[PDB]
Each structure stands twice: as structure tokens, then as C-alpha cells.
């Protein structure tokens, strides 16, 4: 983040000091300057790594989630009333690269949720400002069956109220992970398979833990259904803030095939280039 | 007047802001606080709890007063398990509707070690040695006295003392477990034997009962409150 | 200047060289030709400490009885291999008693070091590169997602190889339900050769016949299970294929030699006895 | 109340934007962090660790393992170019996906010495002299050993020590370079020669592999984050 | 929160407005500045410097170089002007074209001294006088040197120095001028007169040209930035 | 009075005289009817500063071997004659070893004194403008913009001419892809009288015979490629016609010497050789 | 190191500086013209190679002369040849 180092004036040198040559072996990475092999002047340095900060790499909200949902009306069966949305970043591809950069994050959350609204057909009259409720359901709280059962009513669900053609909605998060941080990567399972039991019994998915529970959102329209159907999509922007990461990883060189590391489609991701081309 | 940009997030209702509002009702003489018994300023103060565990929930005590019971007998000594409890205390259905288990449904994490209280409700001529364990997750379950003794445990011996208290320890690897059935933040697993056997003189009722408790340590705690799944409106 | 007013309660509300001698209860080991040893990240294995204490019944610590080197099956290294991989404390389940302590405990814990061995002449090439994978999750071979099986996830001391390209399982009626590594894309979607973001060591034969890797301890918990959670894995590929003589045929043993360090459990129960493939 | 005014912005939702929000879990008991080995502060020290460069992506070789090794042999020397790289850290296909160019792809402009290591593994019964030479752009790409001498190069002597490192020194006209193939900004040609040649004695391979890595130095620096090319999504 | 009240201009965009917005691109390490010759603070300097102005727009000369040669001859004495311009820095044609004009058309308001500077570019052997003239406005433009010396005016003397500066001072009753063909804001009138005539021996040209050049003093000033008509755009 | 306070971290956020005798090197020019001399902006030619140094590698200064004055081809001034211009390091790429050091290295820096003579006797008439123009771009012949190709937009020491009127290129076939510098556009669409806005001097026949400019490396970098950037261009107009005793076809000579400066070069390989016309 | 050149040995017996004494520039007690030097500096004094010979079992050797052999070698023989001393 801070400013770099200078360069400093270097003339010719002859001596039994070596740093060009080194050895790899070691795991280590040679630490050599300009100034180490090729003669070099003074140069007072002004450039800064402020934006290569783990902070400014994840300073930028990312989408991670379109909810569709309608109003229509409770006859229509072609038409989802409201929507529940597991709460994950993996459903897009961007930030879940920048974020497996590394095996262990720990940072607070700010959502911002961007309300868009269209009608489907024209004869049908129109429609007042809508009124939507997001509901922030944790893990082993009760899910709406309908669009207007008892769960609505969030007497402890925290729920956002977001007027259509208000500013998006936003709210922050702060760290919520049961364990000390954030698992990007878990090599191992939720349950272990004890000799004895059914198959059935004991097998759980690879790389799947309770870790990366973190409930659902319920999204629905307030509002009763106008004699005309209204189309709405939510898309949830997803900012990382007060950023600690560790353990950093090669990032992903190949197309994401599930909420895994698997990989089927695009496995030849160079191109092909002369040896001796420039 | 001053200029001023208006940021996103204006217009917006939030549930969980924090804003000043006009006074509907200005200069209201409010009337002032007495000095109430029993003023709760924590949760935790009510999930500090001793209650009932509805251990009992078979088909025909589920839903009456004798799902609380769990029955005793003076039979030879086994290495069965008196009861089972797996130690989900917001998503296990003999622990959701306890105290505890009804203030964790209102939160989605929580940490903390937990208190047993067995309570023996024989006779006063009635002795025995129960071994109660808890086991940490990731091996099976222990189906006998053999395996329990591996955990943690206690055991309790019936006598001038009626109660004993186990204390599960808090031995997780998050910092947090989540409020539902989960594999990766699983909690373990709580188990009742009989140390050596439950022993009557003659004229004595050979079958007695056990009464249990749950509640949460000083150390307890939640986080990230929610909406419970334990009520619901129709219409 | 700018002014900065928090208007909330909640903080999240807020903007943003060569001979070495290395000995671990009755084990020793003795290298000669060393490229010096990696401690991972800097950090040497230590025990929980009482501000991290998630547990609060006693830890038990075998000390020297868990705390010594265990050599695992030698592989053997051609022009055709690939590269091999280990799963810690996987790798170490069937050693002694520290696989006792790790299946008599509900959570382990505990860092290693992990040292390689693979001697070969002066008349002998080939390079290996050996790296510590803190969660190393491998590639499926189905197109169910996070479809492996318990038993082929955890091998064991043989641990598993790599694989020159993917292959799909297709059997639907009785699946594989095993890994599917890829070499160049390190079994996990990603170039082999960004590896060495890792922590790691080159075995270059012409300059070294060993590696030595410090692993502390690596989780986002002070302690997990050990037998649901494998912490590190270690991936050996040959960067440089083997090659001697242009007699062909040749082939080199690769033993590996682990030592559990700061071993810490908790929860004793019952054994666990996992389910075998 | 207060009278203000509504300034322009208002309303907008800028996705860099830096503002306070309402906690959606207030009071919140969050998990404190513990000490993780292997923590980064900035994405410059990812950097400037050394990753193997893709240098042979020939058709058989491209998408293998045999992609990161260049084939030497104990031939008659000649001046033909061993190998040869456009300095394009992020836009070169040899370069962009090493963990450098993965880095640099994700930013706009960027700015420092870079750091080529080679590591030779053929036998230890192999020596030789090889020329690694930096060419700083606007001649023509050096096509063979006579024409990289003039550069920036160092000789590199295979012996006891199998790995040379070359530095690119920083020589830009611009304070910064993009991080695409572009003219006004290019970076220079990065070149391989046999100075003497490989010499090995019978019984020995006659053919030997050398290894390419980069990294950055620690006068780098990126700026202008952007999203990268190197990740997409269908549908 | 607290409470505020949206005064009028909330939600406009007014492209003069000096506010703060969210940076786009966070912790840029923006590149930093080098001491590059000819620094500009204001437009003022450059109006300060000599531009040499077309004085001849004839049909034949306009939009060549021949339009900025005035071309004299050692022809007898008159009275009749040389050359005559309305003091319009911006309007007038004639200067409207140069770099002082060029800046007051991107002005509404100005207001100070100007100097044309007149140089001889004869042969050394050329001897005259002239009578550079400015009236200010009210009175007829003068059409004859007697009408002329009444008004401010320099007699230059055409020697080993052949160049000669008139300062046209401010004389003004508004304080700021229009930079368009205003009577209530008219500047006044150049004019050019022979005080005795051109002389040239023989063997040499009988026919010279002057160059005129306008360029502002330092009391100059303008206000008031307005959009150019001297660039436009199609479609 | 009011009050201004900053919410953002980044600061973009925020709200907005006759006898003169010059030596150089082995070099040396005498002027008796000199008209002074302009330094462009003020600033003296200098070497960069440790401050303000991109490239890492040790400059090579020849100093007096590339430091000194080059005359250029002369060229002839008549009655009809237009105006010239030459391109800056472009017109010395062939002058000694300051051209050699200009191709055998990737970077050169370099300021330069110019000095333009024009002898003529006291019975002629004219004026000549010498204009430094930094960056001078000059508008090309054809309907595509950018069009004119390196070896027309780098001519040498002999440099280019004026033209009274722009003509359009309309062969498609073999297109010229040369300059079409209009005098009174001044070669980029601006009129050819504000041109004294850039450093200048006039060399008027009555009273000086030349002119020197010392121009400063002036540039958006400390240090640029030479074959591919010209920093100055060097343009001369007739600002008054060439006449003379009314003899009619009178024609002299105007000698363009310029000395670089403070030359510096980095990046050293082996030699650049440009595609020639 | 001598401009931009660069020179690394492994297997060097050591260096000879021919009788002991390194070269240096003209002293203003010996020197003859009287006309400014010019000094090329890194521009000349750098290392160039020559064309490299072939050692057989048959080579009898071979000479060079200096400055003679370095007369197409960069800077360094345009300073020769543009000069008189
Ligand atoms: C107000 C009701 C609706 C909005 C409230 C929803 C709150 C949900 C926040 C907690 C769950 C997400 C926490 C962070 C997500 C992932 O774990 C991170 N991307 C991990 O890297």
C-alpha cells in the first residue's frame, strides 16, 4: 500500500559476488534489483501499490444473484409469487475467482440490491409503485410456502422494505462465519462413513461443510397482483469490506463446472505460440 | 440552500436502520418506571435456564407430560443406552422446544458450552451409577457403554443428591455453530448407560424416572438473529 | 483533508544449506545433498493457545509418541509418471500412535514436516517439483458435482497420482466416484506451473536428492477433525521429465517421510472406524 | 428541519462507491480471528513470487506439462534464439497466465522491473554458456546472438549453480505500460542464445530441459482495476 | 437518521457544480509528475505573447500567407491610411483569427491595454516614418492623418530598429468590453499613416511589406467563459 | 467564508546580442549579426535527474562525440519558395556518432541548439520565421486519416517543404502516404500567424542574419525512443518574400546547423535499421 | 563491466595488467595537442568480440593488432577514423 523503494546509482562491478546465480531449489525467490545486474542511476520513486491492496482488489460490488419474481396473480401457476436464493457467492464466476485467489478470507459484507421491474403484456391495464420484500432467511428458520404465509411477518427475520424507484437498497453485514474465517476451499467432508453402515449412509459431497451455510433471502412483491402481470429481477451486488485474506492460490485457469473445484469444458486454455516467436 | 449529494440508499426503508423520526405525540408526560421484578436485559439470561427436555418422544408420549419422562428399571445391568440426544440444540426436535432451543431459533450462529441436569425420581431407597457422555462429532455414534466412555462423560452416582450436571464443552472448529441440522458445524452426541444398574430393596417400585435439563453456560452466546421457524399465520 | 463520521453501531456498518540432521522422538534424519528446508509461509508448527482454545476439555499431547517421523510406500518415478499425491493427516491415519490419537478424538490437530526423498546419479536428470496445498480440493471424474467418495478421498499412505488428461466417468449404473487430477492443471482447475504460490521445493537432480517442507498448522479453525478434514495435501509433479543415460527404462524411488509436529487432540470417544473402500 | 439541497449523484448507485450503510444484524457477537499462517496484504506480493512461464506452446505441447520446458542439446553452437518473449507481461500468451500475468490482468497499467529466473535441469555432468538478453523496444526483434548482445543480457554459467536470474530493468517512455498488446507502450523482446554450447560427456543425456519462471520486483506496481479476460460465463 | 430536508436543485446536474464523487478506480498509484518545459496557469499568457495578424483579407490574399503582409512603397506623400482596423479583439476579423482573439472568443467579458507591434521588413536601405494611430470611439474613424494625430498615436521611425510597439490603452466607460460587434462596448480605431514617406536608394526594392502582430498587456483581463463559434461540428 | 471537507480516500475524488560565438565539442560557430537567441520555455537542456529516471540500466553519454553541431543540406530561398520543416532527432539519424548511438539504443534523450543562417546583403528584403514546435504533427494527403507512412513522415536531414494549397492524394492504387504541410495552416490546420505562440525567432534580412533556439528535452516522458518519436520539429516560413534590386530570380542559401544536448541512451542492442523510403 | 558489456568467468587464472600499469588518460604535464579531447567514454570503451577462430591440432596460432582489429567495432572506430591522434 505504502510507497516503494528508490533506485539507487550503480556503476560497474567486479567481484566474487554473485546474485544473479542462485538456486530455485530452495523454494525461495530471489530477491534482486535492477541495480544487481545492470548498471542503473538514481531514480526517487513516486509509484505506489495503494490499489494492489487486498482492501482496493475487492472494493467493488460485484453481482452474484438475478431473482426473478411476479405479480401476477395466486391462479396463475406460471408465475413465482416470490423467490428463495441460497446465499453464495458461486453463482457468478468474477468475484468467485478474485475471491479463490486465496484459500481463507475474513471481511465484512455490503449488499446492494438493484430492483428492476417491466410489465409483460399491454392489455391489461397497469400498475402502482410496487413495494418488495427481501427476507434474510438463516439456516433452520422457517421458508415461505406461499407469498403471504405467517413467515412474512419477520418478527426476528431481518426483512428489507425497498420502494420501487428508490435508490437500491443496501444494508451491511458483518462477519458471520461460525469459524474464525471464511473457507473459500474445504478439503474434506461434513459427515465421515463408519464400517458397518448402509452406502446410503455416511456419504456426504466432497468439499461440502456447514461452513458456507448462510441462509437464503426470500424476495416477493408486497403488493397484491394489479390486473396485469409485472416482471421483477433483484440483482444482489456483493462487497467485500475490511478485507483479511491467506494462504494465496494459482487462480482459476479454467471454466467453473459446479460449486466445486470440478472441471469438464475448456481444458485447454493457452493458445499456440512459436517457442523462438516473439 | 447547502449543497448536498444525495448517496444510494436514500428513499429506502430498511427493517434494521437506525433514524431519528418526528414525534407524533410531542411533549406526551410519559408515565415513569416502578421498579418491576425480574427485569431480563440479555437473552442469554433466559437460555441460562434450566428446562425440560422433552426426551421422551415416542408416539404416545409426544405431546402429553410423559415425553419429559425417561423410565429406569431395576433390570440386569446392560450396555444399551438409556437415552440419545444428538447435540443440535436449535434443529434437534428434543432440544428445539426447550428455553434454549427456542431462543436459538431466533439466531443463526451460537457458541458456548452447555449444561445437563439429570434429575432421578425414584424412591429414596433406590440406588444406581448412570454414565452420561458426550462424544465430539466424526466417529459413529456410540451405540454402547464401550464407546461413550471414550467422550466426555460423567458418572453420576443416586444417592443423598438426586441431580447431576454434565457440562458438554464447547470443542468446535468454527467459532460458531449454525442453529440448524448441519454436517460441517455438527454438534456430537449426548448418551445416557447404566454404570452398573439401578438397584430397589422389596416393596419399592422397580420402575422409576428420570427427569432432563438443558441450559446454556456463561460462556454462551448468538449472533445474526433471524426469524423462527416455531410459529406461523395462515391467511 | 476529508471528514470521516461513523453514523452506526456496528463496526460492519463502516466504510472500508546442504547437510542437515533433523531428529523427532526416536527419528532421525540425515541429508547431505539438501536445498535447504521451507518453513511454510514462515510460521513453525506451535500448540493452540489459550487465547484460541476452542475446546475447553484437556488437549492430550503424545509428544514423542506421535511426534516422530513415519515413512509412507516408496513410489517409483519413470519418464511415464505424472506426479503423485498425499492427503495430511490422511496420509498418516495407519502410523503408530498417532493414527490412534487421531481416530480415539473427535478433533486433532497438528502441523508436520514433510521430507522427500529421491537420490539418483550425476549421469541422472529430472526435476520434481514438491508443494504443500493448504485445502487441496482434486477435480471430480463425473459430471455430478462434489461426487467423490469418502474412500477414494482419503487413500491413504498410497495416496493417488495424477493423470496426463481427463477422463469422464460415465458408468451411471456403478460409478467411480474417484479424483481425476489432471497434471497441468493441478487436479484443481488451475496451471500447474502458478503452483508455486505454494509453499514448495524443487528436487533438481543435479543439484538436490531431498526436500524438506515445515507445515504449520493451516485452517480457518485452531482444531477440526481429522478424519473428516485432511489440512495440507502434498502434490509431487515432474517438471522436468526423468531421463539417463538414453538407456530408457530407468526408474527412481521417491520415498516420503512425514513427522506429525505439535500434536494436539480433543473429544477422546470410542474409534472411530471409517468406512473402507 | 435543516434545509439542504439535492446535489447531483444523488440517488446513483456507484458500484466503487464508499458509504455507510445500516447493519442488517445488529449486535452481532462476531467470531474473532485467529492467527492464519500465510496472510496478504497486497496483491503485489502474489506478484512477486515466481511461477513457471509457459515458454514451448507448440501444438503437441500446449495444455501439458511439456509447456514450461525448453529442450536444450549438446549440438554445435549456433545464434539462432534458444527461446524468444515479447515483454507483454499481461497480454503475451506465454506471459499472461503466470501468476504475474494472471495479476496484471485485473489492472490497467502497470510499472516495475521484472525478474526472468532459469533453472537448468539437465545432468550434473552438463555445462555450458548460455546468453539471456533483454532487448528494450524500437529495433528490430533480435533474430540472433550478435544482435541481443547490444541489449541488456547476462551470461549465464551452467555449474554448481543451476538457475540465472535476468532482471528487466524499468526502461519506459510512460511512467506506466497497458497491460494489452499496444505499440506505444510495448515492452521489448526477451531472448535465449547458446553462448558456448551444452558439452556433456558419453553416458549422458544429450538432450536436458531448462525451466522459465517470472516474477515481479519490488518496485512494481499495478493501478486501474478492471475485470479480467481470463474467467467467463455462458447463459 | 437525521433529519434533512431536500431544498430545490436537489437531483440536478449543472455542469459548472464543484462536488465530490466516488473514485472509479481506488488506490490508483497514479504516475507522478515530471518538471516539463512551458507550464501554462493561465489563458492570460498565452494571450500575452505577439501573434502576427492578417491584415489583408483581400480576395487574393485572404487564406494565404499573403493576408499578414501589408505591403508599403516609395511612392510621394499621402494622407490616405496604410492600413485600418476597429479595435474588436474578438469580432473584428482581423484579429478575431488571432491567439489573443482565439482566447476572448472563449470570453464574454475583457478588459485592459493591448500593443500591436508593427515590424519593417524592407531592406536595410529603406528609411521611412509612419504614424500609427488609435482613436477612441465616438467620432468619425479617421480617414486622413490630420484626423488621425489628434488621437493617441506613435511616430515610428523606420532605422536599425524595425520594429515599433503601440499600446492602444484602456479607455473605456464600461469596465468590461464585449467580446462581439457592440456600439454601446465599440473600441475605437487603428490606423496606419505615412508621417513622411518610405525612401529607398536605387538598386534596391521599391516595394516592402510590414508585419502586424497584437498580443494583450498585463493589466488585460476577461470573465465570463462562453463556448467558441470559431469550431463547429456536423451531424 | 465556508467549509470544504473531503469523503473519499483517492484525491481524484475531490473537488477541482549581435556577436555571439557558440562551442560544442569540437565545434564552433561565430555570428556578428545575430538577433540574440531564445531558449524555448526558459529551460536549459539538461541531463535527467535520479529523480525522474525511468529506465533501471546505466545511460551512455558520449558527450562531445555526439554533442556537437551537424550542418544540414542547404537550402535555397527564392521568391516562390514556401517553407521548410525538418523533425528532431529524425533530421540527425545519419550525422555521426550521435546517429549511431540513436539506433543502437532503445531510449535516447537529447536537447539541441539550432542554429539557422541566412546571409543576404543590404539590399535584399525578407523575413524569415523559425518556429520550435514540439510534437509537430503534420496533417497527411489522403482521404485516411493518420495515413502517411514512416519513411515519408521521417525524410532526413533534408526534411520537408510547405505547400501554398493542400492537395488530395487520389491515387488508390499507389497512394503517396506523404505530408501535406499547407503554409498558412502551418501544416496541422492552425493558422500559420499564431505559430509564434511556439518558441521562434525572426531572421529579417535588414537587421540579422540568424537565429539559434536552444530547445529542452521536451516531452510527456523523461525518456522516449528515438526512431519512433520526434520530440521537435524545426519549421521555417517566409514571413516576408525573398526580393532583391528588382532583378528578379534571386535565390539564397539557408544553412541549418543543430547540436544535440545533453544526450542520453539506455536500452543498448544491436543496431535499429529503419525501412528506408 | 565496462559500458554495457559485461564479462563472468568461472575458470579464470587470474588477470595480467601488462607491466603493472592500468591505463589512464593523458596527463596535462604530457600532453601534446593542445586542441580539446574528445572522450566517447561508455560509448567507446566497451567490450567488443571479434570473430572467433578455430583451435585444431593443426593451428600454428594467430595475431591481431590493436587498435587495428576493433576498426568496425561501433563508436570506437568512428572515433578512429574521424580523428587525426
Ligand atoms: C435485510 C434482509 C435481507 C438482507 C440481509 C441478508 C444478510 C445475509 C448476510 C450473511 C450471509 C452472507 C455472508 C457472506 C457471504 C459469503 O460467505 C462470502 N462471500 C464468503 O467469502
Known amino acids: 500500500a505504502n510507497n516503494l523503494p528508490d533506485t539507487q546509482s550503480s556503476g560497474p562491478a567486479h567481484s566474487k559476488e554473485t546474485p544473479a546465480l542462485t538456486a530455485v531449489e530452495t523454494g525461495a525467490t530471489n530477491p534482486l534489483v535492477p541495480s544487481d545486474t545492470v548498471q542503473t542511476r538514481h531514480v526517487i520513486q513516486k509509484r505506489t501499490r495503494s490499489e494492489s491492496t487486498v482492501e482496493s482488489f475487492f472494493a467493488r460490488g460485484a453481482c452474484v444473484a438475478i431473482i426473478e419474481v411476479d405479480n401476477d396473480a395466486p391462479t396463475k401457476r406460471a408465475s413465482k409469487l416470490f423467490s428463495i436464493w441460497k446465499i453464495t457467492y458461486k453463482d457468478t464466476v468474477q468475484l468467485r475467482r478474485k475471491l479463490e485467489f486465496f484459500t481463507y478470507s475474513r471481511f465484512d459484507m455490503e449488499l446492494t440490491f438493484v430492483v428492476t421491474s417491466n410489465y409483460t403484456d399491454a392489455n391489461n391495464g397497469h400498475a402502482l409503485n410496487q413495494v418488495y420484500q427481501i427476507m434474510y432467511i438463516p439456516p433452520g428458520a422457517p421458508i415461505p410456502g406461499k407469498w403471504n404465509d405467517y413467515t412474512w411477518q419477520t418478527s426476528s427475520n431481518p426483512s428489507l422494505f425497498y420502494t420501487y424507484g428508490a435508490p437500491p437498497a443496501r444494508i451491511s453485514v458483518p462477519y458471520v462465519g461460525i469459524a474464525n474465517a471464511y473457507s473459500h476451499f474445504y478439503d474434506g467432508f461434513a459427515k465421515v462413513p463408519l464400517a458397518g453402515q448402509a452406502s446410503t449412509e455416511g456419504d456426504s459431497l466432497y468439499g461440502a461443510a456447514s461452513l458456507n451455510d448462510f441462509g437464503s433471502l426470500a424476495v416477493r412483491v408486497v403488493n397484491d397482483h394489479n390486473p396485469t402481470k409485472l416482471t421483477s429481477k433483484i440483482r444482489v451486488y456483493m462487497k467485500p469490506k475490511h478485507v483479511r485474506v491467506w494462504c494465496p492460490r494459482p487462480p482459476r485457469a479454467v471454466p467453473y463446472y459446479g460449486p466445486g473445484v470440478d472441471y469438464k469444458d475448456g481444458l485447454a486454455p493457452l493458445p499456440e505460440k512459436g517457442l523462438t516467436t516473439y | 440552500g447547502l449543497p448536498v449529494l444525495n448517496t444510494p440508499g436514500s428513499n429506502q426503508y430498511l427493517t434494521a436502520d437506525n433514524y431519528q423520526s418526528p414525534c407524533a405525540i410531542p411533549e406526551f408526560d410519559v408515565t415513569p418506571p416502578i421498579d418491576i421484578p425480574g427485569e431480563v436485559r440479555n437473552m442469554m439470561e433466559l437460555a441460562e435456564i434450566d428446562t425440560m427436555i422433552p426426551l421422551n418422544l415416542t408416539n404416545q408420549r409426544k405431546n402429553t407430560m410423559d415425553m419429559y419422562r425417561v423410565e429406569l428399571n431395576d433390570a440386569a445391568h446392560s450396555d444399551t443406552p438409556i437415552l440419545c440426544l444428538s447435540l443440535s440444540p436449535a434443529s434437534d426436535p428434543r432440544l428445539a422446544h426447550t428455553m434454549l432451543g427456542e431462543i436459538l431459533n431466533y439466531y443463526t450462529h451460537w457458541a458456548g458450552s452447555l449444561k445437563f441436569t439429570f434429575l432421578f425420581c425414584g424412591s429414596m431407597m433406590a440406588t444406581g451409577k448412570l454414565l452420561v457422555s458426550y462424544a465430539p462429532p466424526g466417529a459413529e455414534a456410540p451405540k454402547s457403554r464401550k464407546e461413550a466412555m471414550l467422550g466426555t462423560h460423567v458418572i453420576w452416582d443416586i444417592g443423598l443428591q438426586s441431580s447431576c450436571t454434565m457440562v458438554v464443552p464447547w470443542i468446535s472448529n468454527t467459532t460458531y455453530r449454525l442453529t440448524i441440522n448441519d454436517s460441517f458445524t455438527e454438534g456430537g452426541y449426548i448418551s445416557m448407560f447404566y454404570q452398573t444398574r439401578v438397584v430397589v430393596p422389596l416393596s419399592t417400585p422397580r420402575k422409576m424416572d428420570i427427569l432432563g435439563f438443558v441450559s446454556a453456560c456463561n460462556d454462551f452466546s448468538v449472533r445474526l438473529l433471524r426469524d423462527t421457524t416455531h410459529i406461523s399465520q395462515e391467511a | ?277
Open chain 3, 1 to 277: 483533508n476529508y471528514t470521516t463520521i461513523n453514523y452506526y453501531r456496528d463496526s460492519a456498518s463502516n466504510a472500508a544449506d546442504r547437510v542437515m540432521q533433523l531428529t523427532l522422538g526416536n527419528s532421525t534424519i540425515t541429508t547431505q545433498e539438501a536445498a535447504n528446508s521451507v518453513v511454510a509461509y514462515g510460521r513453525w508448527p506451535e500448540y493452540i493457545k489459550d487465547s484460541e482454545a476452542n475446546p475447553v476439555d484437556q488437549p492430550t499431547e503424545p509428544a514423542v509418541a506421535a511426534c516422530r517421523f513415519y515413512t509412507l510406500d516408496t513410489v517409483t518415478w519413470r519418464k511415464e509418471s505424472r506426479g503423485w499425491w498425499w492427503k495430511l493427516p490422511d496420509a498418516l491415519k495407519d502410523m503408530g500412535l498417532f493414527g490412534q490419537n487421531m481416530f480415539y478424538h473427535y478433533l486433532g490437530r497438528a502441523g508436520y514436516t514433510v521430507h522427500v526423498q529421491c537420490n539418483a546419479s550425476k549421469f541422472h536428470q529430472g526435476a520434481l517439483g514438491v508443494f504443500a496445498v493448504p485445502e487441496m480440493c482434486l477435480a471430480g471424474d463425473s459430471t455430478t458435482h462434489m461426487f467423490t467418495k469418502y474412500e477414494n478421498a482419503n487413500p491413504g499412505e498410497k495416496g493417488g497420482e495424477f493423470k496426463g488428461s481427463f477422463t469422464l466417468d460415465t458408468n451411471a449404473t456403478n460409478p467411480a466416484r474417484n479424483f481425476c487430477p489432471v497434471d497441468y492443471l493441478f487436479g484443481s482447475g488451475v496451471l500447474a506451473g502458478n503452483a508455486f504460490v505454494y509453499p514448495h521445493q524443487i528436487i533438481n537432480l543435479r543439484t538436490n536428492n531431498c526436500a524438506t517442507l515445515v507445515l504449520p498448522y493451516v485452517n480457518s479453525l485452531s482444531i477440526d477433525s481429522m478424519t473428516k478434514h485432511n489440512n495440507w495435501g502434498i502434490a509431487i509433479l515432474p517438471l522436468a521429465p526423468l531421463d539417463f543415460a538414453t538407456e530408457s527404462s530407468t526408474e527412481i524411488p521417491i520415498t516420503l517421510t512425514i513427522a506429525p509436529m505439535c500434536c494436539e487432540f480433543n473429544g477422546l470417544r470410542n474409534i472411530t472406524v471409517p468406512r473402507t473402500q
